[PDB]
């Protein structure tokens with residue numbers, strides 16, 4: 001029984017290595033990673049890989065790993081797939097912990113834009129969780145933390161993290177992680193998966209996929225949003241992605257809205273994430 005070596009980047013940046021049988025479905029690897037992580041609330045998470053065109057793709061747990069990674073390395077990342085809109089309702093602290101690690105990388109990467117004060121507050125909870133109570137011994141007026149907090153670090157931001165960290169004395173890790181999540185969940189790009197597209201006129205937009213629905217980001221002014229209940233069918237054809245919007249009250253006809261994606265693979269990818277997010281949110 002021939003086995004392939006898998007390397008998984010975990011959310012703390014460490015590498016987990018394991019072997020699966022070469023005809024294994026994605027679920028087999030995912031189960032091994034989740035057992036390694038002592039993660040029970042596995043439904044929110046998934047594995048990604050980097051494809052032939054080097055995009056991020058979700059590893060389909062129901063399909064053979066080899067028919068997905070195809071010519072590529074058996075190298076994966078462990079990620080949040082479905083961002084819980086209310087993380088306080090998760091059953092385990094360890095689930096909230098992994099969601100915090102993902103969100104830290106969402107922030108440092110610039111996928112999750114954040115004001116100065118929110119960056120500092122999120123940072124202060126992370127430090128409280130990781131090091132415990134503020135210690136002046138490990139921080140002079142020139143202190144710079146080992147923690148990555150933001151896409152661009154400043155001395156100002158480091159100072160503000162420390163000032164807020166002082167206020168959290170006696171906060172336990174689970175408590176600080178819950179406060180981190182209570183702030184993060186409110187950010188306008190929380191759990192929003194952004195896809196580059198063009199509208200039916202060739203104008204560059206972004207489509208955002210999230211719990212509440214599909215978002216369009218035309219230009220600063222005019223952000224369209226389609227709550228999942230308003231979406232009856234999602235489809236793709238060639239480089240095009242279509243959503244069938246439910247008929248408004250007293251309207252005779254459903255309405256179809258069309259987008260141009262960079263290529264066929266990008267249209268299929270957007271279709272699949274939309275279908276998955278509609279099902280997820282429908283079972284909330």
Ligand SMILES: CN(C)c1ccc(CNn2cnnc2)cc1
Nearest residue numbers: 027030042043045046047059061
């Ligand atoms: C019906 N719900 C609760 C549901 C949703 C997604 C999955 C797949 N989970 N997974 C495995 N590998 N990546 C993601 C399982 C169940």
